[PDB]
Amino acid sequence: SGFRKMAFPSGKVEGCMVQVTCGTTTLNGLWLDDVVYCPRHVICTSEDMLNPNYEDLLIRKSNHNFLVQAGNVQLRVIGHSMQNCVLKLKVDTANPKTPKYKFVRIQPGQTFSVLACYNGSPSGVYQCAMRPNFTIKGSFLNGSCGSVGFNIDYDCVSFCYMHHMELPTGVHAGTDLEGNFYGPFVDRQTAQAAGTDTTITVNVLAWLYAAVINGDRWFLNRFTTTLNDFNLVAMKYNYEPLTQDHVDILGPLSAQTGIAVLDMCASLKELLQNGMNGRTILGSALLEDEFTPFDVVRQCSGVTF
Amino acid sequence: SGFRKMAFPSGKVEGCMVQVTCGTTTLNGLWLDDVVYCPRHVICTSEDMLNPNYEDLLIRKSNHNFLVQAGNVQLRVIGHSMQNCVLKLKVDTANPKTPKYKFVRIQPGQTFSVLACYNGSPSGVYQCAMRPNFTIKGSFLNGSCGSVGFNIDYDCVSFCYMHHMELPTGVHAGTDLEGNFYGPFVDRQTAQAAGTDTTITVNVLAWLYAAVINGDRWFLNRFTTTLNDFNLVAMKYNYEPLTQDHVDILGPLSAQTGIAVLDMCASLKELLQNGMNGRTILGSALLEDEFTPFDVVRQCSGVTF
Numbered sequence: 001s002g003f004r005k006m007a008f009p010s011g012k013v014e015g016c017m018v019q020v021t022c023g024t025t026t027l028n029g030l031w032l033d034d035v036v037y038c039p040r041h042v043i044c045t046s047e048d049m050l051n052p053n054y055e056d057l058l059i060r061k062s063n064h065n066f067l068v069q070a071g072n073v074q075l076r077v078i079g080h081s082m083q084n085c086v087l088k089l090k091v092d093t094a095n096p097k098t099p100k101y102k103f104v105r106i107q108p109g110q111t112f113s114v115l116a117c118y119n120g121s122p123s124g125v126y127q128c129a130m131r132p133n134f135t136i137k138g139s140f141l142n143g144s145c146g147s148v149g150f151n152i153d154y155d156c157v158s159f160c161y162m163h164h165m166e167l168p169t170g171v172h173a174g175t176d177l178e179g180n181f182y183g184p185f186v187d188r189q190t191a192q193a194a195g196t197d198t199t200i201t202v203n204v205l206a207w208l209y210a211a212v213i214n215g216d217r218w219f220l221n222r223f224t225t226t227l228n229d230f231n232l233v234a235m236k237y238n239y240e241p242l243t244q245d246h247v248d249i250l251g252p253l254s255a256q257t258g259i260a261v262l263d264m265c266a267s268l269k270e271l272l273q274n275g276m277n278g279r280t281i282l283g284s285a286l287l288e289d290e291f292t293p294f295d296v297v298r299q300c301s302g303v304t305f
Numbered sequence: 306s307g308f309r310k311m312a313f314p315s316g317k318v319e320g321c322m323v324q325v326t327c328g329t330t331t332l333n334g335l336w337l338d339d340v341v342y343c344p345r346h347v348i349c350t351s352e353d354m355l356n357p358n359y360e361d362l363l364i365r366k367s368n369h370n371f372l373v374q375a376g377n378v379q380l381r382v383i384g385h386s387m388q389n390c391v392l393k394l395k396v397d398t399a400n401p402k403t404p405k406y407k408f409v410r411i412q413p414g415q416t417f418s419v420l421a422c423y424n425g426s427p428s429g430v431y432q433c434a435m436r437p438n439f440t441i442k443g444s445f446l447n448g449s450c451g452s453v454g455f456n457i458d459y460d461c462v463s464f465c466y467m468h469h470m471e472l473p474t475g476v477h478a479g480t481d482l483e484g485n486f487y488g489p490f491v492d493r494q495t496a497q498a499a500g501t502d503t504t505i506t507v508n509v510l511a512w513l514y515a516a517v518i519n520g521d522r523w524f525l526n527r528f529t530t531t532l533n534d535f536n537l538v539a540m541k542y543n544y545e546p547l548t549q550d551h552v553d554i555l556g557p558l559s560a561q562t563g564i565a566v567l568d569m570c571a572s573l574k575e576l577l578q579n580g581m582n583g584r585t586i587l588g589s590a591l592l593e594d595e596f597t598p599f600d601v602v603r604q605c606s607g608v609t610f
């Protein structure tokens with residue numbers, strides 16, 4: 001028993017992290033087969049940062065301008081190109097530690113593990129969710145750009161995030177591994193802000209099921225509700241709308257615990273309208289929304305990688 | 306910016322996890338050099354759980370009674386010995402993936418990463434603290450025994466915990482890697498119960514310093530306290546006593562933020578009296594006690610906001 005915010009084991013990704021230096025700028029790269037991926041803003045000085053022309057900045061660069069270190073071994077860059085906001089550095093050696101992998105783009109509300117890295121060395125791992133406002137509430141210091149996020153399904157690593165920047169509120173923005181930003185952000189120093197965030201309803205429900213499975217039941221009640229009724233409540237409390245597909249995804253947990261989703265929606269309605277009355281749920285005084293239904297099932301089932 | 310419960314990258318430990326089978330029982334083992342460490346209760350049978358005599362159970366075993374599987378490979382057991390509550394199986398292959406490592410016994414309040422494993426395969430990684438009552442609040446299902454906890458300050462893995470059992474309240478008990486239990490617990494199924502747990506005061510103070518470093522000051526006040534008056538108050542809320550050692554340990558964070566340790570104690574006193582009045586600290590509505598002073602310094606910027 002027990003329920004913890006849990007990251008995937010990070011070993012398969014640790015073996016892919018390299019250090020990329022261009023000029024005075026050092027950050028992290030992802031080395032897979034014979035390509036190192038990193039943010040294209042690595043090629044900017046701080047003046048270009050204000051309004052960069054990335055194709056122009058890249059023309060000046062020769063392969064030898066990119067210093068890439070894998071541990072204490074240098075990698076020789078033999079080609080370079082840009083895809084959206086990522087730079088792709090062709091190297092002369094395929095990574096012998098390349099795992100089975102795919103590039104995937106995730107949806108807001110989905111969770112993933114972040115391997116935070118500095119100078120090509122993994123420093124920590126934690127679990128994140130893509131917020132509805134397309135930021136992530138990460139923990140990142142200067143030098144962490146190019147750190148990546150991922151999930152593991154079977155033996156295949158699905159890379160979903162590469163870290164690019166921090167917004168003024170201290171939350172974080174980045175791209176998928178094809179260099180498309182999550183959210184309405186751009187890689188330059190201009191005025192940018194996170195939009196108003198909302199709470200991930202299906203994830204809060206999943207976490208209430210996790211609580212019940214772990215013996216925390218005080219919030220259960222006799223009442224049920226309807227989607228249209230609940231979604232009016234959700235809107236009022238800045239929760240994402242709950243869809244029928246969300247209800248279906250929670251089906252397993254409803255059958256396992258004997259609490260139908262709209263039964264649990266009635267619990268959540270009452271929590272939103274009245275608070276927790278001094279109690280906690282799974283050790284939290286807040287409603288937790290960064291566990292997906294799959295996360296709850298997986299941790300309450302013991303799946304391995 | 307940001308502040309997360311952050312585990313160490315798990316890859317160095319992942320490459321040490323094996324499966325140990327004795328009879329009908331399978332759990333996890335830790336393979337370092339040519340030795341596999343696992344809980345000695347793997348040799349218990351179903352009527353041997355209340356008062357097992359481990360010396361008598363072990364003398365009846367031959368090396369080939371121990372099945373050790375490392376990934377797809379069977380390891381050959383060529384010797385065995387018991388040390389306190391751990392079994393040490395000598396095998397005929399040194400683990401080629403053995404990291405630099407040491408065995409460290411930790412004190413209550415210390416944090417570490419847990420690599421949850423089932424059948425020798427890692428499932429996930431999360432952060433735990435050794436509670437004042439010598440339990441940990443983990444996430445462990447049947448088959449998780451022999452999972453380990455560790456830190457990796459620099460490049461050396463300090464192994465500090467091996468999981469043995471779950472107590473009636475759902476919390477977890479285990480040993481150091483020399484097989485000595487944390488707390489008054491024994492590897493018998495006779496009824497035992499964790500002592501009343503308390504809050505790790507020095508860690509809460511660390512986390513409040515983390516909140517100031519990341520730019521939040523709302524909970525400070527104009528007051529101070531003597532160390533003894535602080536302790537007289539905090540023990541009425543089930544907080545651990547704060548010692549001069551703890552005050553010394555917090556010196557660096559005090560210097561970085563400009564807030565004297567006993568002034569931060571006065572802030573904590575008021576937080577216990579008032580609650581948070583609808584506010585949060587580093588995203589939490591409760592006072593967090595599983596970040597040590599060392600953790601905060603490792604994760605936070607060196608420049609206060």
Ligand SMILES: NCc1ccc2c(c1)CCO2
Pocket residue numbers: 041042044045046048049050052164165166186187188189190
């Ligand atoms: N706006 C994120 C960002 C961060 C660094 C950097 C750039 C953008 C361009 C030059 O270097």
Ligand SMILES: [Cl-]
Pocket residue numbers: 410411412415
């Ligand atoms: Cl310690």
Ligand code: NA
Pocket residue numbers: 220221222223224262263264266267
């Ligand atoms: Na109900």
